[PDB]
Write a protein that binds this ligand. Sequence first.
Ligand SMILES: CNC[C@H](O)CN1CCCC1=O
Lengths: 300, 237
Amino acid sequence: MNTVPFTSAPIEVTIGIDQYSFNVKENQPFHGIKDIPIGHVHVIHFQHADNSSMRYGYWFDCRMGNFYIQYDPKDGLYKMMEERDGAKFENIVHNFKERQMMVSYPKIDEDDTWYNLTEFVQMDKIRKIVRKDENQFSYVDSSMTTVQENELSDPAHSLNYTVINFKSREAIRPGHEMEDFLDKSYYLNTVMLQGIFKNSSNYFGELQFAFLNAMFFGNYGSSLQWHAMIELICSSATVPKHMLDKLDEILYYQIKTLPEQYSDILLNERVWNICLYSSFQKNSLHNTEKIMENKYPELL
Amino acid sequence: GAMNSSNYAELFNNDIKLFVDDTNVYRVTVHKTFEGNVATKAINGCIFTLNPKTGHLFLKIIHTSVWAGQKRLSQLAKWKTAEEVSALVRSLPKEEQPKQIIVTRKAMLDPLEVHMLDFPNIAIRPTELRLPFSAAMSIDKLSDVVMKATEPQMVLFNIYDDWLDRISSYTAFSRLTLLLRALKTNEESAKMILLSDPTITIKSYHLWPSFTDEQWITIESQMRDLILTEYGRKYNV
Ligand SMILES: CNC[C@H](O)CN1CCCC1=O
């Protein structure tokens, strides 16, 4: 188990850690989060009490370094930092634990939610999507735009996801126009899976990361990416059976975790109705179709 | 964006544009089988591709052999239309290629966009206008060449005959759409109007009769009457 200490909490803030969250009052004696499970990426995220605008946060993996949070009064936000002095870090953490100034990562033993949401998400891939090579952790917020959004403005602050566009030369083989537009298997299996992503694990990891950025930060371009990646699979007649089974599990846990009150803005009616009821894979997502029909029958 | 009553005069500016109408591409007769089931038999069709400024009509004849062994023919017809329009554009010299293609039916937008990906600077546009180009097969000479075709073929016409020697393209398009609307609402009556007077003939190289200016005014007034009438005969007014 690992720890992310906080220097202090000078401004009132709601802090998220993965799917959990808690309120910290202005100048409350809060000194971080302990018992964080090793083996997974994690995200620690923030919404200030005064400006619910800009949710923002940091993806990290405690195996890659010792990380802490410190408020910056000039830039006005909680920043993640790396401590290279491992002895200074262990000493800090042990003192804060002894004084019981830390919240415990509140995982129920039975509960595989976070694993199921991050199964294919790798820190190495996250750092290639979010570029700040000098840090081992990655900042994301509600306003950051994707490369594809920028094509249609600061490149250093962009989300570098693979650009998916169904009406593009990359997607459509000359002389196979109708075939490739109505059955996207070529584009999925040859273009996206073999020459870009390299395997279905990189594909699913990017699809899971996009969902999590949409859910936790309301990042609109991430939501667009998540739906595009679902629709590319559902609109392919030829998909490896292992991928369809895994997609049904991925989407089931995403829909399960989504806040009931955000479904209106985080779920695209057209994509989901097409995917569940019209697409080649309309009969292949049993778990996802069942939870969608019982939790969000209005959208359908 | 979409073409409508407001931006109507754009059709007659000097940017090359083409209307594409696919309503006569896939044509069938429906009939009973010996077992009393229903079946279709395809007949030859055509793509109606029209420059509204010049009257040049690129009539691509669709021979029934193109449907042989194919499924979902109504869907295929839209893609075949887009394939043939794309091939037409590629066949034209760069300075003759259109800057816009306007499709008369919105279901042609995605097939044409995908076939024209190589031409990112050619705008593919829908229209809110309810144009009567389906009635092109009521023009006897066009119907004749489509029905006689034994193989795929493109035939070039000027749908305005020589009218542009005396009238503007705005006015020529208005006459064309009036004639075609009449032919669509009541083909027999419209055709009687056009040919009643046997002293007015159709030149070998023309589609319509050689009316004088005054006779076109009479003709145009007779077509308007026809259209309003049928609009009563239909709605009882
Ligand atoms: C940073 N853009 C990367 C793309 O989103 C997906 N890719 C490319 C190679 C491996 C991988 O995951």
